[PDB]
């Protein structure tokens, strides 16, 4: 929801074409009294309480809360035997059928999320295999998130990725309250 | 719009068995978009229900209403169609099984009133439906006689139980 922007919009009685004049006198005609043909009671009139977009849904959970969520997702996967640790993601070939057959033999479920340490250093073989698949998705460590972890039945992390995530997630537990954004220079950050 | 009445002359029944009674021929005919009122047409359709084809034609030939000529026109072409295309032996051996009028697609026109006021005038159209069945016209129901009432009254006395108990 935080990056949702709804683009639905309707026209109020003030924005519908025309509708300026009073359609007929207040009294004497025997008809119901009306001020504008673009009233919400009229066919073709304005909308009383319709969408008024574009509308933003932005909000931010506390940084510590979002970090804790990543911990829980990793624990749930390990506790339910859906997490597998690899030394590297290098395949013998770039054929996607190999990776598909490997997952079936090892009982990895329908979909698998592959997490590498960095985008630039991803092995070419795994890049070629995953690029041609739909349920086998390769992401860098910085791209890990709860939604992708829950959408995918199996999670595969490389050993460097494991060290990467522990450093980032445990830093939240022992850190001071910020004095200014962490993007700015600190004594012991980054690393 | 619906045009189901014209599709009833296309129903092919399976061959009859040797011992079954000869099935009467049934002919469905109608005229669409007649410039005439269905309310006024109903009286003419009501008149010839149950009549023989020849009696209905005679009654309509001497009626002064405009619908009479149109219905007579429909009855004649239906009679010809029955013998020509529906294997009816005798053209006179036909009777009006069903005859009714329906509402057609009508047009709206303005009718002018005084003082700058108006009304909306409807140019009325109607349909006419007729069903011809082979055979003599069914006899009318005899008026319920005194013996029938007395028998019915005693029947209700005899079906009378002791209510709200064992």
């Amino acid at each position: 929801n935080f990056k949702r922007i709804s683009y639905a919009k309707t026209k109020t009685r003030a924005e519908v074409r025309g509708g300026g004049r009073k359609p007929w006198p207040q009294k004497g005609t025997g008809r119901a009294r009306h001020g504008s043909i673009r009233s919400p009671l009229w066919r073709g009139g304005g909308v009383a309480h319709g969408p008024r977009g574009p509308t933003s849904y932005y909000y931010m959970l506390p940084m510590k809360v979002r970090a804790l969520g990543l911990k829980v997702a990793l624990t749930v996967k390990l506790a339910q035997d859906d997490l597998h640790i690899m030394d590297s993601l290098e395949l013998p070939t770039g054929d996607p059928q190999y990776l598909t057959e490997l997952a079936h033999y090892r009982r990895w479920g329908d979909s698998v999320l592959l997490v590498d340490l960095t985008h630039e250093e991803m092995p070419q073989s795994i890049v070629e295999a995953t690029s041609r698949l739909k349920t086998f998705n390769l992401i860098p460590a910085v791209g890990l998130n709860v939604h992708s972890m829950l959408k995918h039945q199996t999670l595969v992390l490389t050993l460097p990725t494991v060290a990467f995530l522990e450093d980032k997630l445990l830093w939240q537990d022992s850190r001071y309250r910020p004095l200014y954004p962490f993007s700015l220079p600190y004594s012991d950050f980054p690393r | 719009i619906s045009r189901k009445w014209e599709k009833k002359n296309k129903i092919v029944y399976p061959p009859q068995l040797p011992g079954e009674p000869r099935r009467p021929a049934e002919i469905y005919h109608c005229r669409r978009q007649i410039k005439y009122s269905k309310d006024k047409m109903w009286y003419l359709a009501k008149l010839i229900r149950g009549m023989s084809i020849d009696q209905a034609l005679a009654q309509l030939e001497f009626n002064d209403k405009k619908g009479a000529k149109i219905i007579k026109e429909v009855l004649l072409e239906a009679q010809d169609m029955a013998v020509r295309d529906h294997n009816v032996e005798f053209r006179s051996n036909l009777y009006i099984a069903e005859s009714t009028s329906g509402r057609g697609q009508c047009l709206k026109r303005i009718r002018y009133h005084g003082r700058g006021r108006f009304g909306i005038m409807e140019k009325v159209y109607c349909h006419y439906f007729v069903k011809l069945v082979e055979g003599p016209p069914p006899p009318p129901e005899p008026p319920k006689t005194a013996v029938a009432h007395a028998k019915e009254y005693i029947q209700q006395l005899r079906s009378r139980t002791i209510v709200h108990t064992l």
Partner: peptide, 20 residues
């Protein structure tokens, strides 16, 4: 008592001109 007159309103012509 001030004279009170309500002039008649003509509806759109097209609503009474449609043909088959």
């Amino acid at each position: 008592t001030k004279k009170r007159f309500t002039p008649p309103i003509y509806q759109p012509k097209f609503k009474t001109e449609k043909e088959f």
